[PDB]
From TrEMBL, chains A, B:
It is found in: Cytoplasm. This is Deoxyribose-phosphate aldolase. It catalyses: 2-deoxy-D-ribose 5-phosphate = D-glyceraldehyde 3-phosphate + acetaldehyde. The active site is at D92 (proton donor/acceptor), K156 (schiff-base intermediate with acetaldehyde), K185 (proton donor/acceptor). Belongs to the DeoC/FbaB aldolase family. DeoC type 1 subfamily. One of its GO terms (biological process) is 2-deoxyribose 1-phosphate catabolic process. The gene is deoC. Catalyzes a reversible aldol reaction between acetaldehyde and D-glyceraldehyde 3-phosphate to generate 2-deoxy-D-ribose 5-phosphate. It comes from Levilactobacillus brevis ATCC 14869 = DSM 20054. The keyword Transport does not apply.
Length: 217, 217
């Protein structure tokens, strides 16, 4: 796998609370240099990122209800629809983990469903971050099934802000559950080229990466 | 200071991504038992908390743009006004740390002003979380001063999700900066009654606390 095609797997990611405009611009320069799939930022930076990436094949994408996933559904939707209207081509939302763990599957479903409707109405795609770190393996499976039932296009391992991120065995579990019906995105803690290839082998069709420069050089 | 009096300083706080309905209910039970000032939650739980605290003197309050502060201003605003209409009595926003650190004071100010105007139109109050952990001492001062100029009612130390929380010297610096013109809320890592009392002596007029039960007993 050449560095060029490895790059097309990568949502190049900068989500730290203290990222400055210069920091975000550097993320955009790096994504354009390596031709990654995306630049993934918090919603505030979507207009800037969109301008930086205009005229290239790199997509702006936004996280929403992130990273806790405990934002009201109405507000996750407003954040998502605003982000897309301002340039986002994909939305990575965070699952309502608390409702999942408390066994309120219908509320988990309703939350994702509302985002899926809003994002799809605008012709874009939705990824659901499960935050595997906080879930039992049965919960990872259930979260995958609910994401699918709600119409999500991808499931995503991690926000990057919990205790651990992508794990090969979790990625494989997710890919087995959704089959080829949803994309699987490995994110959080991906530091080396070997780790990245491991994730792809384990089933990931996309990756969230912030240490991208180290990996592709 | 009686335990009754101390309780009225406390926004009893449960913000973990994996907090279940039962977890949140228990937080409400505890707040009602000790008659704290508030129960502070992520915006999803506001209708439930409002119901649980109905007919009592404990206020539901919501964090917004939390914990990263990097939501688009308009989306922070929507999350805040929506939360108020569902029963939130106060809003604890996170300021835009990235624009603060990048020295774009115009944008930090406008972001806080948007929330302050909207929250005040509904007759509620706004606290601004600085996230001191990520800031220079000068930035803490500037953040307090921008918060004051924007019309905010409180400056708050920390989200609870960064590298450190309330520190006595930071609280003192904030109180000195805002005088008696704004409240100062110490939050994050307050684990003992002694620590809580020290935060008050340092100038805090309100506190965010998760270990509220241990502290009051």
């Amino acid at each position: 796998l050449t560095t060029e095609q490895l790059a097309k797997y990568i949502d190049h990611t900068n989500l730290k609370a203290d990222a400055t405009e210069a920091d975000i611009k550097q993320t955009c320069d790096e994504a354009k240099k390596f031709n990654t799939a995306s630049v993934c930022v918090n919603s505030y930076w979507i207009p800037f990122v969109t301008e930086q990436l205009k005229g290239t094949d790199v997509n702006p994408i936004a996280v929403v209800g992130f990273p806790l996933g405990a934002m009201a559904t109405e507000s996750k939707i407003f954040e998502a629809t605003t982000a897309i209207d301002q340039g986002a081509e994909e939305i990575d939302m965070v699952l309502n983990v608390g409702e999942l763990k408390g066994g309120n599957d219908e509320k988990v479903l309703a939350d994702i469903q509302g985002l899926a409707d809003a994002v799809h109405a605008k012709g874009k795609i939705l990824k659901v971050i499960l935050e595997n770190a906080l879930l039992t393996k049965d919960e990872i499976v259930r979260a995958c099934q609910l994401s699918e039932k709600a119409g999500a296009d991808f499931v995503k391992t991690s926000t990057g802000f919990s205790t651990s991120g992508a794990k090969v065995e979790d990625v494989k579990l997710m890919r087995e559950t959704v089959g080829d019906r949803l994309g699987v995105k490995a994110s959080g803690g991906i530091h080396s080229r070997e780790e990245a290839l491991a994730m792809i082998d384990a089933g990931a069709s996309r990756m969230g990466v912030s240490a991208t420069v180290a990996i592709l050089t």
